Amino acid sequence: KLTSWKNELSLQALKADLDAAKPSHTAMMIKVK
């Protein structure tokens, strides 16, 4: 546990957010391409 916060994020939450936000960004980059 890196910090002293009562509720810490942990890496799984951040990776889940990344995987959840990926689908819209992937659909967007096709247009720029």
């Binding site: 689908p23 992937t26 659909a27």
Partner: protein
């Protein structure tokens, strides 16, 4: 001797006549019972390619 008897099961109340019966015989909460969604494990894996 006015008795409540049992409105349901046909034994009418003492006060009630020959053409009537009790208007309300139960209480209804109005708060229903529902079931939540089944959890998904395979969908979070996939990455979409919206051509």
């Amino acid at each position: 001797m006015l008795n409540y008897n049992a409105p349901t099961d046909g034994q009418k109340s003492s006060i009630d006549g020959a053409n009537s019966d009790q208007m309300q015989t139960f209480f209804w909460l109005k708060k229903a019972i529902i079931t939540a969604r089944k959890e998904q494990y395979f969908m979070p894996l996939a990455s979409v390619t919206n051509m």
